[PDB]
Amino acid sequence: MTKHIKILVIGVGVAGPAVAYWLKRFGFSPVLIEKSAAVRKGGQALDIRGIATHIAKEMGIYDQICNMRTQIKCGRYVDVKGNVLHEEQGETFGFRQDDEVEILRGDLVEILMKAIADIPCEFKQSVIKIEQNEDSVTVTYKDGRVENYDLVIAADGIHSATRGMVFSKNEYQLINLGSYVSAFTIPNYLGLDHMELLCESNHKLVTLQSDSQADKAMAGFMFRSKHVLEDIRDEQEQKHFLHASFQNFGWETQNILNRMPESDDFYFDAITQIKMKSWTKGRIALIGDAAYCPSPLSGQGNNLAFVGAYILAGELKKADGDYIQAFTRYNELLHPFVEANQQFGVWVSESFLLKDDEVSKEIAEARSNKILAMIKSVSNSINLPQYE
Numbered sequence: 001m002t003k004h005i006k007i008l009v010i011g012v013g014v015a016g017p018a019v020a021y022w023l024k025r026f027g028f029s030p031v032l033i034e035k036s037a038a039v040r041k042g043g044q045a046l047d048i049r050g051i052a053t054h055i056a057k058e059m060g061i062y063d064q065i066c067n068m069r070t071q072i073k074c075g076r077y078v079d080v081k082g083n084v085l086h087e088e089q090g091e092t093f094g095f096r097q098d099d100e101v102e103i104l105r106g107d108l109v110e111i112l113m114k115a116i117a118d119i120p121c122e123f124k125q126s127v128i129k130i131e132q133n134e135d136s137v138t139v140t141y142k143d144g145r146v147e148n149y150d151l152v153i154a155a156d157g158i159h160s161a162t163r164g165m166v167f168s169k170n171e172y173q174l175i176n177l178g179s180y181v182s183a184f185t186i187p188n189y190l191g192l193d194h195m196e197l198l199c200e201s202n203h204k205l206v207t208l209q210s211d212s213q214a215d216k217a218m219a220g221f222m223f224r225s226k227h228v229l230e231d232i233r234d235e236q237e238q239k240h241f242l243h244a245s246f247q248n249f250g251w252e253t254q255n256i257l258n259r260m261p262e263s264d265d266f267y268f269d270a271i272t273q274i275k276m277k278s279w280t281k282g283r284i285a286l287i288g289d290a291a292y293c294p295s296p297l298s299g300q301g302n303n304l305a306f307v308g309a310y311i312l313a314g315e316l317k318k319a320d321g322d323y324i325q326a327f328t329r330y331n332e333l334l335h336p337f338v339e340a341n342q343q344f345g346v347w348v349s350e351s352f353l354l355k356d357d358e359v360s361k362e363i364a365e366a367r368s369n370k371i372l373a374m375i376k377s378v379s380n381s382i383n384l385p386q387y388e
């Protein structure tokens, strides 16, 4: 029976635990593995907007998410001289409304994992090889141990090892949106109180906020650049490049960058999207960022993870475990919605910053209202199936 179908879920993030939840609810018996030793606390703030709120509520975790929601009360667009150009309430500032909510990744994963306390999960575990045939998927773990599964669903992030193991370069694209993003935590030296500041130029943007940790502040950087690092993963090159890229930005960048060396959670990466004609091959399926990362410029990453988890789990249910039918339905039903949200991400990367003009209240206000309207449109641009 479906209960006895062996399903491996790789990755304890959003999509992995989410699909595990729905698989378990729909009468399957998934297992989780995780390369990290444990769920990393805090981290990047994630939006739950559009369809994802409905799914979150059905999962019975919505109130828990709200209890752990970010609490920015005020967001401000400021010029390099510190003057306020445009101010908005926190949710509106984050282009959210209605029942939509923002939460730090670590807080959400913790809630997700509590919702699946029954499902087996193994941390500090990694797959080093995958081979499949018509009957089974043979998984080789780090220590050389082998296990066979009926299905493997990989939710191991944008830099998916599984994607590289299973798919060829002709079967997926790494779409570069021509910009870099960086972030790190520093002492709240300005003494911000549940407030975010945002300064921008023609090709660059800098944010600074404090929220749940009163004596800490999260710095953010975004900028367009055709420059390519000799080693994009070299953290020292990343910092030199970031410092050099913003050396004439003004405002608080000097004060932020002076504190960058002592920050312990430094992050830097190109803004990228994953585009695949098919997220599946045989008995293996990709989900979440591994399959269709819309990049942070979209604000849809979480939304796509939840919807994907629901649909893939659902189609497997209706197919009574028949993965060939389910994976086809998974690809067909979800691609337009994914492509819609990715294109919104592409649009943001091309048009958010003003290439020729300086920003003002009217621009920031008009741009904000437009993004709020457009994001609401795309995030709800799917008629979700009802598998129950």
Ligand SMILES: Cc1cc2nc3c(=O)[nH]c(=O)nc-3n(C[C@H](O)[C@H](O)[C@H](O)COP(=O)(O)OP(=O)(O)OC[C@H]3O[C@@H](n4cnc5c(N)ncnc54)[C@H](O)[C@@H]3O)c2cc1C
Pocket: 010, 011, 012, 013, 014, 015, 016, 033, 034, 035, 036, 044, 045, 046, 047, 048, 105, 125, 126, 127, 155, 156, 157, 158, 161, 162, 181, 183, 287, 288, 289, 290, 293, 295, 296, 298, 299, 300, 301, 302, 303, 305
């Ligand atoms: C700076 C930044 C800002 C963002 N802002 C937003 C936003 O405002 N709104 C929004 O909706 N989205 C945002 N995102 C995107 C969002 O974080 C992700 O889309 C979302 O977390 C999807 O989660 P996932 O489970 O698909 O992937 P992840 O959450 O990345 O899952 C990866 C997990 O898999 C594990 N893993 C990795 N490799 C392996 C392996 N080989 N074997 C086993 N396990 C492995 C890792 O330990 C990790 O726990 C942002 C991302 C970044 C980087």
